[PDB]
Design a protein around this nucleic acid. Structure first.
Lengths: 700, 300
DNA sequence: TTTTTTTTTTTTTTTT
């Protein structure tokens, strides 16, 4: 028999009772689906976690979906409870979903997540066939739905339908009034007639679901649509995004018929159209709510489009690196280029809610117009299939990129960022979606010229990439940070490390003195230096923090199209559901390191000589940068270009890695008893793998 | 040159080590302030004092604000260590504040307080300019502040401002509701509209800064403002008190915006106003925290 | 005592 069935029979007739199971045999996790925790008593002092998770264990005989007790949510937060792990259940309890007629829900009250399972069989049947239903929904609570395991803007599950194709509708007997006319007469007329518009901007999803509120699929997406008489902001309400979101895209002629015109929202701004001729309507807004007969939205095909209507054409503000160099800040633009680098999918905490996160990742789009790549801060645009599976050597096109500039720092910062109404599309060979635009044709011409010339731009994927480089002087660094939180204590650092969540990144500043720096030939005369101060105070340290370890996934690795899937999966966000690995995968140490140096280990003794720490120094600058003076100092972590070397062909005479390492060690030795201000980078790679890499050493 | 300079140069390179000063020269106390003793280990059976003291001993040349070892607070409880006295420091130590960029701090660890000085100079320069920063703050801690020397219900220091003046806020399109309106509708109002209240009673300050919890300006004052017939016990939190307490007098017409509404604190005792005709709303209370823009509190 | 941010809302009259 199966441990699942044994436990179920053991605790089936004692609902909501904590019962240690008779026998504990490891079970295999196969999925972790997240959803909102609702219908629980929030009066409790420890406010219930905002979200709860369902774990789909398997026992070799049957696989059953379980509801993890929210008290254990920290395990999923730190990615300890992965997919395909050998967890052992120490406590179990039943529970009946009164909103449904089914069986008990095995509740995992206590667990001991272990190691990976060598036998991950997804062919096992489901003990409770209700669990194996086509629409994958949460165990508890009416018509509930699942959210993306990490962020709230990524569509996830099966409710997100993608089967809305154009339909031929005859417009005879239809009025299709102009948007300006509607703006004039939306406060008097009763039956708002039809509208023929074209989507010009599609924005990310917005999850406004709150606990203990009678809300069903609380999603809203903002679409800007334009006709021959202006443009308006169209908003899709809950229960409509699931059916239409994955299908609606920019450039689709829609026929909205039964809508609701409201006064518009003052806390949300309407993006300016690419073509200024389009008159902007700001006093009006169109709300699309799900209706009984699904006719409120119709995707009119292009073939039916008549020039007589003169519908506005989807334009684009495509920009090239050279042009971007001359564009003021906050000047929206579009970028088409070749992905020559992709970074980890890091996460940041929303400033509004402490339990929500943004998923972002840095990518160095590049073109033939300049020698520097577009640095784009790619936040999730509710396009997980593209965002998660992005790889170098791919023609990448984003839609709405706000320009961000900072000239105070000596390394002038010029990186683009994705806006709310942005979009991501991967292009293939000649411009697939945007061939007509001349800039796309020029980019394709450059691609062909490079291909026939035998030149290939260097490619990288993943790694430790703290793009924003701290300024050259601590005063300028602190000019933005508050005085009370500017610095921390070497002792308090431990809590900072222990507070981060999956891929949450943090930057802290610590006051101390470099005591001993050691060089670790990383890839496959003096490498260690010790300070007399260290030899004296090493025996009187209250707590010597040991975080000078570099993980294999923090080393950027040169991309290889053949191992594309493996390389991508080694740096994406943790998948929600297990998927068996094709054949055997290679070793993450089997790929060449895009870096060009070995990592050092720096020991810092606090100003009071009581506490110490061991950070790891991971410079990303090549010796050519040293020779041409593209680095503020040898103790920094980035060259000014903030980009990896391209087709390195000039290291024949330049000092080798060992010479640069000796220079770095000597520079560190120059700071013997000097109170320096280190800038550390704390990133938690999940599964209790927190990397603490040094960024900059601000000397007096 | 000076005793201060000699001792500091002697003990700068040995933080958290106790060294008898090379020379013991009487030094005049020119100031004595009191602040919370957080950051100390509360695991010792003799729990360290809830407050520590900073003494601005002055030599003939300079005066450098020092730190009094909490074990010496007995000399200040009896007022034996007062301003204007002459004392002979016997033990010193160097401590570095890890939340500020600055030089070492002299840690007084044993004194022999004598008698009043014959000549006290208030014009002696400050050796360390950091000590001379106009918004005076305690030597230890990041955003710490000095309390009153003896009682905790008296504003003290430069954090307390009196610069607030009446402002002519236009009421062209300001949505002003009544207190009873919130009383009936405050659990459904996603946004709480503006208010136009008038102060009736202003309470004495209350310091709730415990040593272990990390709080900034643990100052809290309860103001009984009454808009229209209704009256509620508004309560200002955190660092809002030392920006509006020395300025707000009873009878000032306040315009509170971007506020919060919650349940009345269980042990709260709302005072009855002079006029009985008013309604004493005692179910919900408006909390005024420091919003990033300075529009939350505007007096008309 | 402490404690912040976010959106959601459907419907049968007028003629002068």
């Amino acid at each position: 028999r199966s441990w699942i069935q044994k436990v179920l029979e053991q605790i089936m007739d004692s609902p909501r009772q904590c019962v240690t199971p008779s026998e504990v045999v490891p079970v295999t996790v196969l999925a972790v689906q997240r959803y909102l925790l609702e219908d629980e008593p929030r009066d409790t002092v420890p406010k219930p976690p905002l979200y709860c998770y369902d774990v789909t264990i398997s026992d070799g005989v049957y696989q059953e979906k379980c509801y993890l007790d929210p008290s254990l949510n920290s395990l999923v937060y730190q990615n300890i409870l992965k997919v395909g792990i050998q967890m052992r259940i120490s406590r179990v309890s039943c529970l009946y979903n009164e909103k449904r007629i089914g069986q008990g829900i095995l509740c995992i009250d206590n667990v001991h997540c272990g190691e990976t399972s060598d036998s991950i069989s997804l062919e096992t049947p489901f003990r409770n066939r209700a669990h194996q239903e086509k629409p994958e929904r949460p165990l508890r609570g009416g018509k509930s739905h699942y959210l993306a395991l990490w962020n709230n803007e990524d569509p996830y599950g099966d409710i997100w339908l993608t089967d809305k194709q154009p339909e031929e509708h005859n417009f005879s007997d239809t009025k299709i009034i102009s948007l300006s006319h509607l703006e004039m007469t939306w406060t008097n007329r009763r039956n708002f007639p039809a509208l023929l518009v074209r989507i010009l901007h599609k924005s990310k999803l917005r999850y406004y679901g709150k606990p203990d509120k009678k809300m069903i699929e609380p999603y809203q997406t903002f679409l800007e649509v334009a006709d021959s008489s202006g443009t308006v902001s169209v908003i899709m309400w809950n229960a409509l995004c699931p059916e239409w979101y994955k299908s609606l895209r920019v450039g689709l002629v829609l026929l909205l018929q039964d809508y609701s015109v409201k006064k518009s929202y003052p806390f949300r701004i309407q993006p300016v159209p690419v073509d200024p001729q389009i008159k902007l309507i700001s006093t009006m807004e169109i709300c699309l709510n799900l209706r009984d007969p699904p006719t409120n939205i119709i995707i009119i095909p292009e073939k039916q489009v008549k020039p007589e209507w003169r519908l506005p054409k989807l334009n684009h503000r495509f920009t090239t690196r050279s042009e971007l160099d001359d564009m003021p800040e906050n000047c929206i633009c579009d970028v088409i280029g070749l992905l020559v680098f992709v970074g980890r999918v890091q996460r940041s905490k929303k400033k509004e809610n402490r339990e929500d996160f943004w998923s972002y990742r840095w990518i160095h789009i590049a073109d033939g117009t300049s020698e520097q790549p577009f640095i784009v801060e790619l936040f999730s645009t509710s396009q997980p299939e593209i965002f998660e599976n992005i790889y170098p050597m791919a023609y990448f096109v984003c839609t709405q990129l706000k320009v961000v500039r900072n000239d105070n720092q000596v390394p002038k910062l010029l990186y683009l960022t994705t806006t709310n109404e942005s979009g991501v599309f991967i292009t293939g060979h000649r411009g697939q979606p945007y061939t007509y635009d001349a800039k796309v044709k020029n980019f394709i011409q450059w691609i062909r010229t490079k291909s026939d010339s035998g030149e290939q731009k260097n490619m990288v994927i993943g790694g430790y990439y703290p793009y924003p480089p701290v300024p050259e002087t601590f005063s300028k660094y602190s000019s933005s940070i508050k005085v009370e939180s500017l610095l921390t204590a070497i002792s308090e650092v431990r809590k900072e490390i222990e507070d981060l969540q999956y891929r949450e990144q943090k930057r802290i500043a610590i006051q101390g003195i470099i005591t001993a720096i050691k060089y670790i030939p990383h890839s496959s005369i003096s490498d260690r230096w010790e300070s007399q101060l260290w030899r004296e105070k090493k025996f009187g340290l209250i707590d010597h923090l040991h975080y000078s370890r570099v993980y294999p996934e923090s080393i950027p690795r040169k991309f290889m199209f053949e191992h594309r899937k493996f390389l991508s999966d080694q740096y994406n966000s943790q998948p929600a559901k297990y998927v068996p690995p094709e054949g055997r995968p290679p070793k993450l140490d089997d790929f060449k390191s895009a870096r060009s140096l070995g990592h050092f280990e720096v020991t810092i003794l606090g100003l009071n000589h009581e506490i110490a720490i061991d950070v790891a120094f991971l410079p990303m600058y090549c010796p050519e940068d040293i020779r041409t003076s593209q680095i503020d100092t040898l103790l920094t972590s980035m060259n000014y270009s903030c980009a990896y070397p391209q087709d390195t062909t000039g290291n024949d005479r330049l000092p080798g890695p060992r010479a640069v390492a000796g220079d770095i060690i000597k520079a560190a030795t120059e700071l013997d008893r000097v109170h320096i201000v280190g800038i550390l980078d704390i990133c938690n790679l999940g599964n209790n793998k927190v990397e603490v890499y040094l960024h900059k050493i601000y000397s007096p």
